[model samples]
Target: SYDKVSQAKSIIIGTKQTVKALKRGSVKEVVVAKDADPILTSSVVSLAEDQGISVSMVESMKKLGKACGIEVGAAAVAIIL
Candidate 1:
């Protein structure tokens, strides 16, 4: 899953950006860190499901952040096509 995020040419980071990308129909898939607060991720997960977009889960926010090439933890990330 991290591979997909790391290799993606286009990505939207954070829950808010992911939501906006999902609504804009540019997100191919969403990767959410399981360790992130549920309150932060739930809406993004639900929205992705409602839109028929795939949602994948990873174990750690830090790992996901690293995959996104960021220096800190990330709660959600969207891979764009």
Candidate 2:
């Protein structure tokens, strides 16, 4: 899943950005860090599921952040086509 994220043509980072992307119907998939607070990511996950967009989980926020090319941890990321 990290490969999918890193290879994405465009990615939206953080729960807020990801939620916006999902709402905009611009996201192809969502990646969430299991280590992140469920409260922080639950809406994003449920919304994605509601929208029929695929959601995948990763083990760590740091690694997901690395996949998004960010310096800090990322709670969620959206892969945009």
Candidate 3:
């Protein structure tokens, strides 16, 4: 998952940004850390379902954040098409 994210040129981080991108019709895929809170991920999962987008899960927030090239942990991220 990190490999894919590392190659992506456009990606949105955080739940709000990810959700906003999902609504804009440009997001290609989503990644959620397995360690993220269910509260944070449930909406993302549902939105992805409604948009017919595929989602990938990472092992932890640290891994997801690192893949996103950030130092802090991230709950979710969306890769723009």
Candidate 4:
């Protein structure tokens, strides 16, 4: 299960879809690019908040993935736990 969580983190999901998934309660964590559009991402953040989901803005998208020491070609990440 932990392995799956780690594997899931490796998958990068674009901001648009991540927001949608968050609204629908489909993910565990919402990790958006630090440099991503805050206004646009805020909609998703609002939804995540309403749903009591965890949200975080890490380093740049690239650095975010690097910090995790994984490769996720995504601009955002939503862990589907």
Candidate 3 lDDT over residue span 7-63, tens digit each: 778888899989989888799888888899999899998999888899888888987
For candidate 1, lDDT tens digit of each residue in 21-72? 8888887888999999999999999998899988899999998989898998
Model 2 lDDT tens row, 1-81: 889988859889899988988878987888999999999889899999999988899999998898889898699999888
For model 2, what is the C-alpha lDDT against the true structure? 0.89
- After superposition, the stretches of candidate 3 with alpha carbons farther than 4 Å from their true spots are none
Candidate 2: clashing pairs of residues: none
lDDT score at residue 33, model 3, on the 0-100 scale: 86
Which clashing pairs does model 3 show?
A: none
RMSD for all candidates, in order, please.
Answer: 0.7, 0.8, 0.9, 4.5
Residue-level error in angstroms, candidate 3, position 7: 1.4
Reference-based TM-score of each model: 0.95, 0.95, 0.94, 0.65
- Please give the ranking of all candidate structures by TM-score, highest first, separated by commas: 1, 2, 3, 4
Most accurate candidate by lDDT = 1
When 2 and 3 are scored with TM-score, the better candidate is 2
For candidate 2, the per-residue lDDT at 61 reads 94
Candidate 4 whole-model C-alpha lDDT, 0 to 1: 0.63
- The model with the greatest TM-score is 1
For model 4 the local lDDT of residue 58 reads 62
lDDT of 4 by residue, 9-66 (tens): 4343666777767666767777766666677667777887789887776656665555
